[PDB]
């Protein structure tokens, strides 16, 4: 068996965004070179709205 848990089931994906969302969901099964945590933001701007 190539994978104990498949990265994504291809029949359930409809477009590119579907692949990335599934890859983020099944990333715990993989050996991550970086383990995610809270993100740090160094830039933020708010634009005027209608």
């Amino acid at each position: 068996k190539l994978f104990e848990t498949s990265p994504f089931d291809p029949l359930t994906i409809k477009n590119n965004q579907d692949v990335v969302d599934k890859l983020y969901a099944t990333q715990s099964s993989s050996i991550q070179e970086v383990v995610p945590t809270k993100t740090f933001a160094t830039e933020l701007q708010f634009g005027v709205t209608s």
């Binding site: 068996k1 994978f3 104990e4 848990t5 099944t26 050996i31 991550q32 070179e33």
Partner: protein, 48 residues
């Protein structure tokens, strides 16, 4: 090494069906393996 002999009848009137196509693993591994390598490695460490 040599194969073990069969029965006498099988060595006189014996026939077998075989296919000689060994195949290749290139189609499975001819891809951008960057994303799937982490998943493959996890299975690899679980084999032993």
């Amino acid at each position: 090494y040599r194969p073990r002999r069969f029965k006498e009848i099988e060595h006189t009137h014996g026939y077998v069906y075989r296919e000689l196509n060994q195949g290749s693993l290139l189609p499975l591994v001819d891809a951008n393996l960057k994303e799937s390598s982490s998943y493959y490695f996890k299975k690899l460490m679980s084999s032993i």
